[PDB]
Hints:
This is part of a larger assembly, with two copies of chain A.
Chain A (H helix, E strand, L loop, with lengths): L1 H39 L6 H9 L1
PDB class: motor protein
Keywords: Filament, Flagellar motor, motor protein
Entry title: sheathed filament of the spirochete periplasmic flagella of Leptospira biflexa from the flaA2-complemented stain
Amino acid sequence: GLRRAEQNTEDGMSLIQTAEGYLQETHEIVQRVRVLAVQAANGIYSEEDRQQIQVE
Amino acid sequence: AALGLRNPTVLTFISLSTAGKANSVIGLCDDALRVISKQRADLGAYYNRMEHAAKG
């Protein structure tokens, strides 16, 4: 059982590390929209530009 | 046709033989480039989209 118990903790480490691999992806996307936002708060953009920005 | 340079049905395109029509073409070009810029902003979103998908 202890040999079996060791493997599951290893498999459990895989699943935990797997999910955090996706969480890294989303944070890169969320921070891109965040930096995309602060450019859209600028005052020299026409309506088409902020509409084009919205599409991405 | 989708740009506005040529009539899709009549199959004739804009002429610049007179001064008055030229300032009307100025607006079309702003619209035509608005059409193109929007699509490239679409494809730029597609181009960025895959990289976020690929990395994960």
